[PDB]
Amino acid sequence: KIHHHHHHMQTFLKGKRVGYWLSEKKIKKLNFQAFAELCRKRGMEVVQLNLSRPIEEQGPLDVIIHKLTDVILEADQNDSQSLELVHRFQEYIDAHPETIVLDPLPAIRTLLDRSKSYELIRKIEAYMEDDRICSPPFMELTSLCGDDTMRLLEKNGLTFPFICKTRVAHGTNSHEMAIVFNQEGLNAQPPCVVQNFINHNAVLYKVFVVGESYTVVQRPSLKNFSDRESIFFNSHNVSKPESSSVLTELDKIEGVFERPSDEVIRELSRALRQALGVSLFGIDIIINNQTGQHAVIDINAFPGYEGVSEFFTDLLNHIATVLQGQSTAMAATGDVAL
Ligand SMILES: Nc1ncnc2c1ncn2[C@@H]1O[C@H](COP(=O)(O)OP(=O)(O)O)[C@@H](O)[C@H]1O
Ligand SMILES: [Mn+2]
Ligand SMILES: [Mn+2]
């Protein structure tokens, strides 16, 4: 009843070379050393890349796995060292189209921007036209509230309550959010993205995607919800494995309370991977308690995968798959085929 296997494509891993770039912090959290040992047993060479040195000397490389998200963000903020690292990486990539990059920098750049990510999700959803999926209205706000704010929100389908998030999707302060409940609450900061709050019975379904495989991990999440003051919170107090606070304590189950559909997750995963070219990412899905629809409220490059015990195996399987796809010239053409 598992019909997809990898034994045959794994045979081709012997002799392949995988470079990786990950922060020391992420290497520790993932225990990336254990993955590197797994690859050797299949006859792969794994090597940590040093982006301060020419990359040519470090190759040849068949695959590069990275999480350069934060370096890219710092390069965006004109950090000279980070700019140098990114340029050196890009130079290499450009010179070596045979090197498979997990994942392409254009996708990483999209995932660093909530406004861009949400618009991509919205368009993908409009293209799929599946009634089991809803795209919460959202918009980017680039000025402090004023006299026209209410009309602007209304015109774009924003309703109270809505959540305010930073436009930059990663790094310092990127997880500081606010829930705005009324007009008085509008003093809650550009550039931010506002997005309609969806009651979802305080259960978050983190879909952790590793190319062709995913694992759904339930997490705590904001409770259902008014002249009340806006709420300011930091999202790592909310939806981490051990998160526990009044913000996540559901008063009672209300409306539709169902687990996500694997059919739906599969179509979302395929569409996002095919459109963006990502493979190592997470989709945060909540179930709208008024419609039972799936709402994708966050998409993250190369997340923590806490609670995904099969990560290294899945990752090795994905590496085998991309090498197989490359070997047989399995290039996508045209638009995303639904
Ligand atoms: N539109 C929304 N409606 C209801 N809850 C939301 C919404 N967006 C985010 N959340 C809640 O806030 C948490 C953090 O939001 P998310 O967009 O995942 O930010 P982050 O990038 O910081 O993880 C989510 O895990 C979920 O609990
Ligand atoms: Mn999230
Ligand atoms: Mn996120």
Side-chain angles (χ1 to χ4, degrees):
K1 296 146 211 154
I2 283 180
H3 287 105
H4 289 93
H5 301 102
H6 303 85
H7 183 270
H8 203 265
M9 49 189 135
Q10 281 171 149
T11 63
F12 298 111
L13 297 165
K14 193 159 279 170
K16 302 289 188 175
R17 297 204 82 236
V18 180
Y20 72 90
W21 194 96
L22 293 161
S23 67
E24 46 155 44
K25 195 165 302 200
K26 194 163 181 71
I27 294 163
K28 198 186 173 65
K29 258 188 271 171
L30 286 181
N31 185 210
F32 209 62
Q33 285 274 51
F35 179 69
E37 182 47 48
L38 216 212
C39 288
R40 178 50 187 257
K41 289 200 290 155
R42 306 280 199 291
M44 307 200 79
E45 302 193 340
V46 192
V47 64
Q48 190 177 3
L49 297 170
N50 179 171
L51 286 187
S52 304
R53 315 264 184 121
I55 300 153
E56 321 279 332
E57 351 157 297
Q58 299 180 62
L61 298 168
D62 296 298
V63 179
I64 293 161
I65 288 157
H66 69 85
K67 190 182 184 164
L68 279 156
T69 292
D70 282 339
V71 184
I72 290 160
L73 173 59
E74 290 222 277
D76 283 351
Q77 291 154 3
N78 297 294
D79 184 66
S80 176
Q81 188 197 33
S82 295
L83 282 157
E84 277 164 11
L85 302 174
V86 167
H87 186 263
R88 194 173 285 112
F89 191 80
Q90 187 66 70
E91 272 195 311
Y92 190 77
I93 287 338
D94 290 357
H96 299 280
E98 350 67 86
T99 300
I100 306 165
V101 183
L102 306 178
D103 285 326
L105 303 196
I108 299 316
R109 290 177 189 283
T110 295
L111 295 180
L112 260 170
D113 183 318
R114 286 190 175 95
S115 182
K116 293 178 181 302
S117 288
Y118 292 175
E119 182 64 358
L120 175 55
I121 290 153
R122 187 190 71 69
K123 283 173 178 215
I124 286 171
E125 294 176 357
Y127 180 64
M128 296 174 14
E129 204 169 337
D130 185 324
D131 65 28
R132 296 170 291 189
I133 305 172
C134 74
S135 190
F138 72 93
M139 77 182 296
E140 191 187 343
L141 299 185
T142 52
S143 318
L144 295 157
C145 69
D147 272 51
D148 193 75
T149 301
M150 283 292 275
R151 181 196 196 99
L152 185 62
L153 295 166
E154 185 215 13
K155 186 159 212 165
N156 286 270
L158 280 294
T159 57
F160 297 117
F162 60 72
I163 301 184
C164 299
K165 307 177 190 183
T166 63
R167 204 221 316 116
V168 178
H170 200 250
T172 198
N173 292 322
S174 79
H175 309 291
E176 294 293 358
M177 303 185 169
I179 310 170
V180 173
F181 285 98
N182 48 242
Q183 193 175 158
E184 174 61 23
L186 287 166
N187 0 261
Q189 294 307 118
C192 70
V193 156
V194 291
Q195 185 187 52
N196 284 353
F197 190 94
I198 300 305
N199 289 152
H200 60 280
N201 291 310
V203 185
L204 165 69
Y205 300 98
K206 288 196 83 77
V207 178
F208 281 115
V209 179
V210 188
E212 302 68 34
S213 291
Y214 68 83
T215 296
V216 179
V217 170
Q218 290 178 206
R219 292 290 184 76
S221 197
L222 292 177
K223 69 198 226 35
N224 302 330
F225 296 93
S226 307
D227 217 86
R228 69 166 97 197
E229 291 172 45
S230 298
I231 287 167
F232 299 84
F233 69 94
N234 180 301
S235 78
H236 18 41
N237 302 147
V238 173
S239 294
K240 291 289 171 163
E242 308 296 320
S243 295
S244 186
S245 77
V246 295
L247 290 185
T248 65
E249 286 167 3
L250 217 218
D251 300 328
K252 71 196 157 81
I253 298 159
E254 302 176 307
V256 173
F257 182 55
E258 297 291 337
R259 291 181 173 156
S261 159
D262 288 306
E263 184 187 337
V264 173
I265 295 167
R266 285 196 301 278
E267 75 184 329
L268 282 164
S269 174
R270 277 191 303 270
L272 290 162
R273 288 181 282 128
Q274 194 68 268
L276 252 202
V278 291
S279 68
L280 308 176
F281 67 108
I283 317 171
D284 283 347
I285 292 186
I286 57 172
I287 299 300
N288 177 326
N289 77 349
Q290 305 191 350
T291 65
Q293 293 170 125
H294 309 244
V296 172
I297 52 153
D298 188 29
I299 174 163
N300 304 120
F302 204 153
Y305 296 89
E306 270 206 84
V308 187
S309 57
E310 288 298 283
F311 177 67
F312 292 154
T313 291
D314 285 348
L315 182 53
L316 208 243
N317 283 161
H318 187 49
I319 296 163
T321 297
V322 300
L323 289 166
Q324 175 72 217
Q326 172 188 63
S327 200
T328 56
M330 211 54 47
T333 187
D335 285 351
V336 171
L338 298 170

